[PDB]
């Protein structure tokens, strides 16, 4: 009875790019098909004077046949009419790293503690997502406080993803 249509999902009201800038540690991830970032995932958000948001990310990614590499990624965000919904062009500093262009939604944040991100790469014909991913970010790499954890869990359920996350470990691999 829950609505899982992507078009129904609420996102962060009056999203403030400047307040969102700085270091975000991925605490949990819902993987898309053909997952890329594995763990040790840390993102750095910036906004420039024209108000355009960009980011970098580092994380371990496992090329198949189990080659471990620390990916260094770059992302640039094109605004839409919703201040919390973006198009993210991304690529690796190395040519061979994955590149592409994903929807990037800030579903919720309080700027100084937690953030919930969401991307639907491909819709189902009923408006639900066929291929999604989602990061939960923390300002503190040791994790969220209980109050924020509980808010995030609610947001995870609203995205119809709450059963599908895994924890992201940080152990200095990069
Ligand atoms: C968001 C700043 C980092 C640039 C985005 C690189 C992440 C793109 C791949 C995310 C999907 C995945 O990790 O499986
Ligand atoms: Cl709980
Ligand atoms: Cl669950």
UniProtKB/Swiss-Prot annotation:
GO terms for biological process: cardiac muscle tissue development; detection of light stimulus involved in visual perception; embryonic organ morphogenesis; embryonic retina morphogenesis in camera-type eye; embryonic skeletal system development; eye development; female genitalia morphogenesis; gluconeogenesis. Detected in blood plasma and in urine (at protein level). GO terms for cellular component: extracellular exosome; extracellular region; extracellular space; protein-containing complex. It holds the Pfam family Lipocalin. InterPro entries: Calycin (IPR012674), Lipocalin_ApoD (IPR022271), Lipocalin_CS (IPR022272), Lipocln_cytosolic_FA-bd_dom (IPR000566), Retinol-bd/Purpurin (IPR002449). One of its GO terms (molecular function) is retinal binding. The keyword Transport applies. Coiled coil: none annotated. Gene3D superfamilies: 2.40.128.20. It is linked to Retinal dystrophy, iris coloboma, and comedogenic acne syndrome: A disease characterized by retinal degeneration, ocular colobomas involving both the anterior and posterior segment, impaired night vision and loss of visual acuity. Additional characteristic features include developmental abnormalities and severe acne. Retinol-binding protein that mediates retinol transport in blood plasma. Delivers retinol from the liver stores to the peripheral tissues. Transfers the bound all-trans retinol to STRA6, that then facilitates retinol transport across the cell membrane. Belongs to the calycin superfamily. Lipocalin family. This is Retinol-binding protein 4. It comes from Homo sapiens.
């Amino acid at each position: 009875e829950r609505d899982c249509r992507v078009s129904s999902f609420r996102v962060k009201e009056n999203f403030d790019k400047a307040r969102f800038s700085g270091t975000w540690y991925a605490m949990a991830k819902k993987d898309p098909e053909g997952l890329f970032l594995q763990d040790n995932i840390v993102a750095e958000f910036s906004v420039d004077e024209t108000g355009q948001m960009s980011a970098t990310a580092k994380g371990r990614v496992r090329l198949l046949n189990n080659w471990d590499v620390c990916a260094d990624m770059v992302g640039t965000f094109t605004d839409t009419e919703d201040p919390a919904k973006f198009k993210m062009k991304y690529w690796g500093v190395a040519s061979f790293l994955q590149k592409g262009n994903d929807d990037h939604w800030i579903v919720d944040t309080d700027y100084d503690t937690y953030a919930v991100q969401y991307s639907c790469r491909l819709l189902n014909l009923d408006g639900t997502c066929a291929d999604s991913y989602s990061f939960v970010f923390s300002r503190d790499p040791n994790g969220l406080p209980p109050e924020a954890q509980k808010i995030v869990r609610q947001r995870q359920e609203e995205l119809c993803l709450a059963r599908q996350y895994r924890l992201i470990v940080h152990n200095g691999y990069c």
